[PDB]
Assembly symmetry: none
Homo-oligomer: 70 residues x 4
Amino acid sequence: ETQQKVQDLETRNAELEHQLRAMERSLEEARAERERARAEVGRAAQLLDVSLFELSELREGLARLAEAAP
Amino acid sequence: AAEREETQQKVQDLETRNAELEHQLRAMERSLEEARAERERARAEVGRAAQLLDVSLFELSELREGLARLAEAA
Amino acid sequence: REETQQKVQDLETRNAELEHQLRAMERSLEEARAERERARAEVGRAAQLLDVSLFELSELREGLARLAEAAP
Amino acid sequence: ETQQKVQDLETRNAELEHQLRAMERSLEEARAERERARAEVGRAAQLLDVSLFELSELREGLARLAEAAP
C-alpha cells in the first residue's frame, strides 16, 4: 500500500498525459485557425493593393482633365 | 439720280448686311461665353471630386498597410 | 459723288472682316461642344469604372465583416 | 525498486503539471489574441463600410455631370 502510492501516481500520470494530449490538439487547432485567418487578411491586403493602384490612375485621370486648358 | 440713285442704294444695303453680321456676333460671343463659363465650372467640379478621391485613397492605403501588418504579424 | 465710293469699298472691307470673324467664332463654338462631349464621356467612363471598383470593395468588406463575426 | 519508482514520479508528475498550466496559459494567450485580431478586422470592415458610401456619392456625382447634356 506504498506499492499503492505507486499505483496512484501511475494513474495521475496517465491522466496528466491524457490531458496534455488534449491541450496539444487544442493548441494545434488555434495555430491552424490563426494561419488561415491571417492569410485571408493578407489576401485582402493584396487585393486592396492592386485595386488601390488602379483607383489612383483613375484619380490622376480626373485631375488631368480638370486642369487642362484653353 | 440717273443711277447714283442705285449706289446710294448699294450703301444702305451693305449698311444692313453689316448691322446684321454684327447682331449675329453679339450672339455668337454670348454663346462662346456660356461655353467657357460652363467649362470652368465642370472642370472645377471634376477637380474637386479628384481631390476628394485622393484623400479617400490615401486613407485607404493606411488601411491596406494595417491589414498587411496584421497578416504578417508573427 | 465719288465722295462716298470710298464708303462702299470701305464696307466691302469691314463686311468681309465680320464674315471672317463670325465663321471663326462659329468654328470655336463647334470645337467647344466637341471638347465638352468628349470630356463628359471621359467623366462617364471614369464613373463606370469607379462603380465596378466600388462593388468589388463592398464584397471585400463583407468578407472582412464575416471574418470578424466568425466565432470558432 | 520501490522507494525509487515513487522518487521518479514525484518529479515526472510534478513536471507534467507545470507543462499543462503552461499550455493552458499559452492557449488563453492564443484566444485573447484571436479576439483582439478579429476586432481589428471588424474595425477595418466598419471604417470601410462608411468610407465606401461616401465613395458611391462621389461616384453618382460624377455620373450626374456626365449625363448633364443640358
